[PDB]
Every structure is written in structure tokens, then in C-alpha cells.
Curated annotation (Swiss-Prot):
The lineage of its organism: Eukaryota, Viridiplantae, Streptophyta, Embryophyta, Tracheophyta. The chain holds residues 27 to 141 of 148 of the full protein. It comes from Solanum lycopersicum. Its main location: secreted. Belongs to the protease inhibitor I20 (potato type II proteinase inhibitor) family. This is Wound-induced proteinase inhibitor 2. Keywords: Disulfide bond, Protease inhibitor, Repeat, Secreted, Serine protease inhibitor, Signal. One of its GO terms (cellular component) is extracellular region. The keyword Secreted applies.
Amino acid sequence: ACTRECGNLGFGICPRSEGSPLNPICINCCSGYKGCNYYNSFGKFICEGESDPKRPNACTFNCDPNIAYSRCPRSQGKSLIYPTGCTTCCTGYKGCYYFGKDGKFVCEGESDEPK
């Protein structure tokens, strides 16, 4: 039960399992998320993510060539939501972290994300 209000948020980020041995995601330990583990294509543990999705680390976009895939508590949907349209804190997804147009964290989403 959410209001009809059109939200004015900036972007959402959602820590989610990404990639596979055969189809590696481009990511690094710095930008990977706390609570997610990162692995090579042979399935060897590389690192836990260092980044808090409420206040992400300053990192480069550079791929860590040791990383092919991640395991996060949640696995569904997009890693990044932009733009957000009319999405509000309420209609936003659980395990997704929405930031204002100023770049500052506003809220985590409260609604179930379709699988």
C-alpha cells in the first residue's frame, strides 16, 4: 500500500548476484558490495565487496580480471536503476538503495521486486 505520489529520486543501486564463469562481470573489490562475495571463473574466492550501498566507495570502473561472478543475498533484477521515474521510497524495491538528485542516500525501497 503506497501513495500515488510521483517521487523525484535520482538513482537506485541494488547489490545482486552478477555474472558467471563463462560470462564474467566487470567489477572490482572496491566497488563490489559488502555482503557479496566475488569469485574467479574457476570459482576461487577473491574478496568480499568493500562498498556500502548507502555510501559507495570511490572506485575506478576498472575490471578486476580475477573476478568473474558474485554471490549476494539477493539475485533478482537490476544492479542499477536510472532514471527512477515516479518511484518513491515506498514503491522502490527492497535491497535497492535510492539516492537523491544531490547524490546523497535517501532510502531503501520497501516493495517486493518482480522475479
